[PDB]
Amino acid sequence: VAEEKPHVKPYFTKTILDMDVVEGSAARFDCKVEGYPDPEVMWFKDDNPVKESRHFQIDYDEEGNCSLTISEVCGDDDAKYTCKAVNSLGEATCTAELLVETM
Template identity: 40%
Template sequence: MSAPKFVKPLTTACKEVCEHSGSRFEAKVTGDPFPKVEWFCNDKKIQEGKRAIFDVEEDKGLVVLTIPDTRRDEEGVYKCVVTNTHGKAESCAEVLVEFDPYEKAQ
């Protein structure tokens, strides 16, 4: 039995993304029992759905958040919080969303 811990902190493939492109956040965690995973953007809890896809591979300790179509209002600090009966850990990564020049031209 052990408290959750990030063995690889939260990272994003690209710190700056174009509006309407995808964002992916990934970390590796350990803990026994395997921790519950929650995601936040600017301290607001993210709900899983079309806009946010959660993936957990317990055997690899991999936790992933994918946002297929990033919007300007989704810019900011993303936080992954992992908890189990023995404790809690968190890790953050920031993403900047560049405006889509094609959108204004239309």
């Protein structure tokens, strides 16, 4: 006797918000994704894919908690960020901006 999750396209329960940050400091974008089969997630920086690095920390829970941490924000980090969640049935996206503050 066995129940399986329902089929549903991806959706954000929480989306990434616009943030301002001081040069040198660190910034984190937070979202939370729902959907099944569990979506795949990709981050973009200005139309460009984001590859995980020392500057770009990305994590993605079993709970759907998805995140992007920028370690010491530079000028080059000023941009519009995107999270695309996709699965068999669809796509969901959210976008936000990073304004690298200069003192």
